[PDB]
Amino acid sequence: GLVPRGSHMASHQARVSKFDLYNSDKLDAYNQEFQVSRSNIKSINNNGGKYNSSTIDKAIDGNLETHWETGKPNDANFTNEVVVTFNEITNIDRIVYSARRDSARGKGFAKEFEIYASLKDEGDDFNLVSSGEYTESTRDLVEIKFNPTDFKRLKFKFKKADQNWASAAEFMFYKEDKLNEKFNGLFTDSSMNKVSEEFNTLEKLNAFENELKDHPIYDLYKEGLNNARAILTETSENPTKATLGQITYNLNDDYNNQYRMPYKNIKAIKNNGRHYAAQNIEKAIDNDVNTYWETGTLNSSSFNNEVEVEFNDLVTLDRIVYGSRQSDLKGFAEEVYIYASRTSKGDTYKLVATGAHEATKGLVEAKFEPTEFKRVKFKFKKSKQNSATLNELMFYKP
Length: 398
Ligand SMILES: CC(=O)N[C@@H]1[C@@H](O)[C@@H](O)[C@@H](CO)O[C@@H]1O
Ligand SMILES: [Ca+2]
Ligand SMILES: [Ca+2]
Known about the structure:
Ca(2+) 1 binds at residues 58, 61, 63, 66, 169-170. With 398 residues, the chain is mostly beta strands. It has 5 helices and 19 strands.
């Protein structure tokens, strides 16, 4: 699902975020209502010519796999710009843009940009609409969001282009989507751990959900709405004590079928350290007691190792089963801190359980009270030899 991008009002700094909507089957439906049709894009020009056959028209041909590239890169004296002319004066609030997507994908990405408007067909009467930047990645298809503005001509300036050779796979234009912008303001800030005032009760939130039901990408809003709901209904952090002990029931296939969360419920895994050699994080969840992750950063006086696993579906767990590397036992979580989040994204973790067990071969369970998990954090509060290793990390239900 979609994650709220934060509210934008403009001073005139554009909100730039990854355009994840492209990976959805709802795109055609969304484009139907909000996209400025390509048939409305009359013509295009630019001030820097073109490299080889990467002609400027290829920037607005509706094909992400064809690109324009400038013939003259940015330097101290020259800034690449593109000017799109529309059939009629068109109200636009968003540009969806990608750099070239060939073998040199990302090269020429508009790391910094300015957007200008003209209501006339000719002459330099352009006024500045919005300035923006995107530092995350050069390879991304990004949504650039600014104040809804009338354009006969839209000028896009490559204030900073990655490696100077400005490129564009596509420039796409969208009309204002008020409900989408309402969704984007669901949380107070980028940490998304506090619901905004206009949705800060279940009554308000549920009514908002109902308001969105006819929206073409309503299905993609559900995750964010559920996230807000989880926050609104969250109970105070009251960590219990986890009883740890050696177990062997992981061998029991039938038992696993009933009580172990399916491995395919794991959306992603990450950790706060790196990893020593080729003992990467993914082999902590490969269902192989012989392969193990090892940390690339040991437990300092000010540092604990912690591993984070995201789930597709929220699940209620009472046990987390783990083991160290079986050769040495170096990195056995002698003392464990377990954190639960009921949201898919955001700074919404809370401590649920604490426990300790001596370093031992095999697998160890950490049994606590039934807790809901959308994501889990496994912290090495105390570890053997100050390292951190996991051969397997498993999640068991009550
Ligand atoms: C494939 C590839 O990277 N091609 C690029 C080309 O598009 C242009 O940017 C050129 C500038 O000298 O550098 C490379 O050859
Ligand atoms: Ca193209
Ligand atoms: Ca493993």
